[PDB]
């Protein structure tokens, strides 16, 4: 499928709009993103912040000002003519029921499929909390795409100024397992469909990995064979340094 790539300028901007706005009482901060969604890799080069207010007890009441949409368009076209509105982002990982109503507001302004961006301001997860969903025909479903970081000298350089393998992956696997454990327990309390369909396919596709263990060790010893000649070459580097240091000792005594 497609891919989502976001520069750290957009990631840091969405995370800094929570403290500046001083949003409290468990509310959300909605903002718009700019970029080019026409290619297979969506690149977000710009982001903004718009005022958003929605009632917690009533999900049928929402308000969004359209002046900021027309004001930022006239502002960007006078600066960067290659940037258009590809969608919008939210302030939290948890999805609400208003995602379908907000999608109808930008469908007239956006000339392509609206991109749903999800950014966690709390950063209570592991790895990259930022999520990217794509709304397509289901009524409507949200297809998620992997989010990456843009590699360029216009962004990552400023990151290096501010700031300055499997062990991390195993901790990420525990996060995915705990999500399925709580989903099954909470499902039984509400009773006594798409999740159960894909759950039985995981078990049948690590008890099954033991059948290939006979053929697994075939390429495992090759690593040790590659490491055997790897360690032998390491002696030629250390012994040559000993011979080099031995010649330095003779130069200091004769001096």
């Amino acid at each position: 499928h497609e891919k989502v790539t976001i520069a750290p300028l957009v990631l840091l901007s969405a995370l800094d709009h929570y403290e500046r706005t001083q949003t409290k009482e468990n509310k959300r901060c909605v903002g718009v993103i700019l970029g080019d969604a026409n290619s297979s890799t969506i690149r977000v080069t710009n982001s903004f912040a718009l005022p958003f207010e929605e009632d917690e007890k009533n999900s049928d009441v929402w308000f969004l000002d359209h002046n900021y949409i027309e004001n930022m368009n006239e502002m960007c076209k006078k600066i960067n003519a290659k940037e258009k509105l590809i969608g919008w982002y939210h302030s939290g990982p948890k999805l609400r029921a208003s995602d379908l109503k907000i999608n109808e507001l930008f469908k007239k302004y956006t000339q392509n499929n609206p991109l749903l961006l999800i950014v966690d301001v709390k950063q209570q997860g592991v790895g990259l909390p930022t999520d990217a969903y794509v709304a397509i025909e289901q009524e409507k479903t949200f297809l998620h795409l992997p989010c990456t970081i843009e590699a360029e000298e216009a962004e990552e350089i400023g990151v290096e100024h501010l700031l300055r393998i499997r062990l991390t992956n195993q901790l990420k696997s525990l996060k995915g397992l705990q999500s399925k454990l709580k989903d099954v327990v909470e499902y039984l309390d509400k009773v006594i469909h798409t999740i159960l369909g894909k759950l039985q396919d995981v078990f049948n596709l690590n008890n099954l990995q033991k059948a290939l263990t006979v053929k697994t060790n075939d390429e495992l010893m090759v690593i040790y064979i590659s490491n055997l000649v790897r360690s032998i070459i390491a002696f030629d580097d250390l012994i040559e340094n000993k011979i080099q240091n031995k010649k330095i000792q003779e130069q200091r005594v004769k001096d």
């Binding site: 060790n217 495992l220 040790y224």
Partner: protein, 65 residues
Amino acid sequence: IISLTYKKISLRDICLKLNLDSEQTVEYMVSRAIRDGVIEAKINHEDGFIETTELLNIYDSEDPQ
């Protein structure tokens, strides 16, 4: 040495090469070394020969690791 030659060898033919006494003496000596994993074979009395239980093919095992 004679076990590593042929996988299937007769019992009486062993006493002919080494000039042993009888078949009862060689019967104990073959089963004595397999305790420490030396010969690694089995003696078939009904068949009449001593078959070697070593098929090699350790490339599929974890022992060289």
